[PDB]
Structures are given as C-alpha cells and as structure tokens.
C-alpha cells in the first residue's frame, strides 16, 4: 500500500480614548465577575492584620471583603496587562520586577 516510517520524539503610556468615534460598549466589566480566584481565608487574615496595625476595635463586612477582592483582581490584572505591553515594547516575553516598577511608575502610584 503506502510506505510507512518511524516517528521521532517531540520535546502613549496613558491610552485615553479620543472624545469622538469611540463606540466601545464592553458589557462584561459592566457587571461583577463573581470569580474570587483567590482563597478567602488568607486575604481575610491579611486584611485583619492590616486593620489591627492601623487601629483596634473595628470590624469589616463580607460585602466589604468581596469589594476588596474585586478591586484587587481589577487593579492586578490592569497592572499585569500594562507590564505585558511594556515587555512587548521592550522586546521581551518574561515579566520582570523592573517591569512591575516601570508599570507602577506609568500609573503614577510609585
């Protein structure tokens, strides 16, 4: 029939949208994700420790904890995408702590 053969092993920084012609209507961010994606107990313990460091005799809320969550993933994914674009602009694929610092400097927080 057909001859066979042996296989081988195989091993600009702020992008503000111009006042006109920007018709983006991304619906997803318009609603909460309900995707915690981070374990609740260590975040809760960390927030408790920060609150204790600030002062005492205070309590938080479960809805407040979820709001802290949502803000955390939002800010962190924004920073990660910023570092990604910085790395592509820097002709690299692996993110480095210097990229984190440069992205934070772009955001102005640093």
């Amino acid at each position: 029939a057909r001859t066979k053969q042996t296989a081988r092993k195989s091993t600009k920084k702020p992008h503000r949208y111009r006042p006109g012609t920007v018709a983006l209507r991304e619906i997803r961010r318009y609603q909460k994700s309900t995707e915690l994606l981070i374990r609740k107990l260590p975040f809760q313990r960390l927030v408790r420790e920060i609150a204790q460091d600030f002062k005492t005799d205070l309590r938080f809320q479960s809805s407040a904890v979820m709001a802290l969550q949502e803000a955390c993933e939002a800010y962190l994914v924004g920073l990660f995408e910023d570092t990604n674009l910085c790395a592509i602009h820097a002709k690299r694929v692996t993110i480095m702590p210097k990229d984190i610092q440069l992205a934070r400097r772009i955001r102005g927080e640093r």
Partner: protein
C-alpha cells in the same frame, strides 16, 4: 433526488484596512502576532508563495532577535499550575468578618435613636437582600433592552392601557 440519481446512474479607518490577521507559531519564541496587513505586492501570490519579494521585506529571521529568553520562565504554557489549589480552616471569632457579627458590632459600638425591633427587622431585611443577591449571581451576562414610555397624559383617553397601569403603579400617595 435519490430516484433521479438512480435512474441516471443506470487614526485611519478600519474599513480602509480590511480584516485583521493572526499569525501564531509554536516553534517561534516570538509572541503570536495579531494585526492587519495591507502591503500590496505583486510577487507574493498564492500560485507561487515562495517567490522572492524585493523592496517589500527582508528575508531574515526575527524570532531570535525579538525573543531570546534563556531565563527561568517557570514553564507556564500549560500542563501545570491551573489545577493546583490550597484549602484551609480560618478563624473569624475575634474580629468577626460576617454579616450577623458585623451588624451586631455596628449596633454595639455605634448607638443611634433606633428601636431594637426596628434594628432586628432591618438586619433581617439586609440578610434577605444578601441571600437574594447571592441567588442572583447566577444571571452572569445579560444584555439590556431599553424601556421607554411615551408622553401619556390624563387628557388623552386612547392611549395604551398597559402603560397607564405601569405608571399608575408609580402613583402619588398624599399624606394628611
């Protein structure tokens, strides 16, 4: 059909640049490219894709210069990392991070001119609203259709009854 067969057998504008293109390769350390191409060349044809293209683009490798990793990249492509998870037991009795304990602490620390049965009813209503929201987290994506009611007035009598009842539901309640 079968019978007949048997019988017979026997910035610029997007619209000016065209659709965007994707070019992803496994062997290339260069990242996947997602962009639109609009260069017009008469030598790069489907008949002879291997024809040389002078004055269009140099025939040199770019993945090596674009990405020479040689670093501990941790190998996060796939096959490891997503499934890994950790679980434990937390303590929430001292600094109560719970809705009932939160409302209890708010009432104890801060005292206002509110009746105790009123506070209990408010707490129960808040708990019911939280439970309703928790049940409603399953809606996920939901597009919105605009709802508009025209300028209906009591002078006109031929207007739609359904809109009249909907706005009647929003009537005015006077107080003596």
């Amino acid at each position: 059909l079968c019978s007949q067969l048997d019988q017979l057998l026997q910035v610029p504008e997007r619209r000016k640049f065209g659709r965007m293109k994707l070019l992803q390769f496994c062997e290339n350390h260069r990242p996947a490219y997602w962009g639109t191409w609009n260069k017009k060349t008469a030598l790069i044809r489907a008949r002879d894709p291997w024809a040389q293209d002078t004055k269009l683009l140099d025939y040199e490798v770019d993945s090596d210069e674009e990405w020479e990793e040689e670093e501990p990249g941790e190998s996060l492509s796939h096959s490891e990392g997503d499934d890994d998870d950790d679980m434990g037991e937390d303590e929430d009795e001292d600094d109560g991070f719970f809705v009932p304990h939160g409302y209890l602490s708010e009432d104890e620390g801060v005292t206002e001119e509110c009746a105790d049965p009123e506070n209990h009813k408010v707490r129960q209503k808040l708990k019911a609203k939280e439970w309703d929201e928790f049940l409603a987290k399953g809606k996920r994506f939901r597009v919105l259709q605009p709802v508009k009611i025209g300028c209906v007035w009591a002078a006109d009598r031929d207007c739609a009854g359904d809109d009249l009842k909907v706005l009647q539901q929003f009537a005015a309640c006077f107080l003596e």
